[PDB]
Scaffold this active site. Structure first.
Site, PDB file in Angstrom:
ATOM      1  CG  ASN A   9      -1.790   1.206   1.360  1.00 46.76           C
ATOM      2  OD1 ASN A   9      -1.923   1.990   0.433  1.00 46.76           O
ATOM      3  ND2 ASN A   9      -2.406   1.364   2.495  1.00 46.76           N
ATOM      4  CD1 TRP A  10       3.302   1.257  -3.242  1.00 50.27           C
ATOM      5  CD2 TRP A  10       3.165   2.709  -4.968  1.00 50.27           C
ATOM      6  NE1 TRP A  10       3.896   0.689  -4.344  1.00 50.27           N
ATOM      7  CE2 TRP A  10       3.848   1.517  -5.396  1.00 50.27           C
ATOM      8  CE3 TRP A  10       2.941   3.716  -5.882  1.00 50.27           C
ATOM      9  CZ2 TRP A  10       4.284   1.347  -6.693  1.00 50.27           C
ATOM     10  CZ3 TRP A  10       3.419   3.555  -7.163  1.00 50.27           C
ATOM     11  CH2 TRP A  10       4.055   2.375  -7.567  1.00 50.27           C
ATOM     12  CE  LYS A  11      -0.317   3.248   5.043  1.00 53.43           C
ATOM     13  NZ  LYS A  11      -0.210   3.458   6.497  1.00 53.43           N
ATOM     14  CG  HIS A  96      -6.028   1.721   5.272  1.00 50.28           C
ATOM     15  ND1 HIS A  96      -5.568   2.584   6.183  1.00 50.28           N
ATOM     16  CD2 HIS A  96      -4.959   0.903   4.921  1.00 50.28           C
ATOM     17  CE1 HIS A  96      -4.277   2.319   6.428  1.00 50.28           C
ATOM     18  NE2 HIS A  96      -3.900   1.279   5.662  1.00 50.28           N
ATOM     19  CD  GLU A  98      -3.261   5.470   6.704  1.00 47.95           C
ATOM     20  OE1 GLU A  98      -3.331   5.629   5.446  1.00 47.95           O
ATOM     21  OE2 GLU A  98      -2.241   5.026   7.277  1.00 47.95           O
ATOM     22  CD  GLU A 168      -5.562  -0.922   8.553  1.00 46.06           C
ATOM     23  OE1 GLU A 168      -4.684  -0.025   8.534  1.00 46.06           O
ATOM     24  OE2 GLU A 168      -6.756  -0.732   8.226  1.00 46.06           O
ATOM     25  N   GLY A 174       1.621   4.212  16.259  1.00 45.98           N
ATOM     26  CA  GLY A 174       1.807   5.569  16.715  1.00 45.98           C
ATOM     27  C   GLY A 174       1.178   5.903  18.058  1.00 45.98           C
ATOM     28  CB  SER A 210       4.931  -1.965  11.868  1.00 46.06           C
ATOM     29  OG  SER A 210       6.130  -1.512  11.268  1.00 46.06           O
ATOM     30  N   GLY A 231       2.977  -1.295   4.433  1.00 41.79           N
ATOM     31  CA  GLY A 231       3.025   0.169   4.374  1.00 41.79           C
ATOM     32  C   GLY A 231       4.344   0.738   3.824  1.00 41.79           C
ATOM     33  N   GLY A 232       5.082   1.451   4.681  1.00 42.22           N
ATOM     34  CA  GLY A 232       6.295   2.181   4.285  1.00 42.22           C
ATOM     35  C   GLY A 232       7.352   1.375   3.550  1.00 42.22           C
TER      36      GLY A 232
END
Ligand code: NA
Ligand code: NA
Lengths: 248, 248
Positions: A9-11, A96, A98, A168, A174, A210, A231-232
């Site tokens: 997922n590049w977001k 998602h 977000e 998720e 965070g 993560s 993710g990242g």
């Protein structure tokens, strides 16, 4: 034997020339990953045409990061599942965290998005997950259960067999707390049982916390974790391919 | 004199082959429209590349129907102003009533979207508008004034001189009620005064209510109405061009 999947997922990242570099590296590196791993990337809407032109004919699939709850209408800014499908996409992420948090998407809205994805010929990646407040209140199962049930309730079993589900741990993203592989497995086992009760027990269940090159093998080794929604790490080809290889 | 503009908001409509048909008709018809009218279409995100390939070098501009409040990050599904800009887009709609309602976008979020649009080299079409409840409570000016002020507050005057603003009489949608040209002018005159106090008095003010071929000339003839942000009529080339011609 269920389908193993690693989906990036590049977001909200990427521009034409950086996208071409990442896509070439990933396509070239994917040739070395064991052949039972289904590898995919979900890109921002305007780059679906680029992803198709670059990946078509290969083993790397592509997808969107959302679709509308409707097929058409007075929904300025929204993109229909039918639009995404015209670019040969295989996937759409729906629900998602977000989007449930920042855009207020309800359980029922996510269920409609799943249906629109299926109707258009996409595989929806249906995201579920509980917050820190929810987890500390002892409601992990009530919450992620209600999220998944809302989606299963609008599908027949044969339709439900076509989804992917992703967990998720929003509570560990965070917040100051972190998740273990065992804590992940505990929720995945719960979600697997709900899927089985519907007659969709073979559905791929991906971990969407993560995931990094150094922890992929431990996470994917768990019995109800069939891969990851990354993710990242999906932004650097070396890390992403490392994760893909660990899903053997 | 200020810039006259007719910009079509397709909303969530269109597929590749229907898009090509509409784009061809509009580009061909646009050649006969008076040359003081700036004609544009705002398309769904996946078709920005298509709009560019078809319209490039001609007098019809194109744009997105939204942009993110951020330049990049962990905002699954959102599209950055920078991404839209890479396809030669001139515009982005920000703060459309459908997004303020269905996505909960606040005044301050819309102001951030305007700034992101400007920083990427786009002209934001900043939408303002009051509901029925608001209009019947006598708060039209308090509401649209606060919406515009939030955007002007985060811009310098030189930056504010680059925006476009569109007034949407949300109170006329699905209510059976309609707006007269004189009522539209009364609100535009109020918004023009706020723009002048900022030093942005030359900005195009577009009417964004129901515009049809048969009412366009009366609306656009008003002294503070510089054109239109067109909804459903933008989907049929004959009706859209009729509207464009009336902005002479
Ligand atoms: Na496993
Ligand atoms: Na006028």
């Amino acid at each position: 034997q269920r389908i193993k999947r690693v989906i990036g997922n590049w977001k909200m990242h990427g521009r034409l020339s950086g996208n071409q570099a990442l896509l070439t590296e990933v396509a070239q590196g994917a040739q070395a990953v064991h052949d039972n791993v289904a590898i995919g990337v979900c890109v921002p809407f305007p780059y679906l045409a680029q992803a198709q032109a670059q990946l078509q004919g290969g083993r790397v699939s592509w997808g969107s990061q959302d679709v509308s709850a409707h097929e058409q209408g007075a929904y300025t800014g929204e993109v229909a599942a039918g639009m995404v499908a015209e670019f040969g996409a295989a996937y759409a992420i729906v629900g998602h965290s977000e989007r449930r948090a920042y855009h207020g998407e309800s359980n029922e809205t996510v269920a409609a998005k799943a249906r629109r994805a299926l109707a258009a010929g996409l595989t929806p990646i249906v995201c579920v997950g509980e917050t820190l407040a929810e987890r500390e209140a002892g409601t992990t199962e009530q919450v992620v259960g209600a999220q998944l049930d809302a989606v299963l309730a609008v599908l027949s079993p044969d339709e439900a067999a076509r989804i992917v589900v992703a967990y998720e741990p929003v509570w560990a993203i965070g917040t100051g707390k972190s998740a273990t592989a065992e804590q992940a497995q505990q929720v995945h086992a719960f979600l697997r049982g709900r899927l089985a009760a519907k007659g969709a027990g073979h559905v791929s269940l991906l971990y969407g916390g993560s995931v990094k090159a150094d922890n992929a093998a431990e996470l994917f080794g768990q019995p109800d974790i069939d891969g990851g929604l990354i993710g990242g790490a999906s932004l650097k080809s070396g890390d992403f391919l490392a994760i893909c290889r660990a899903a053997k």
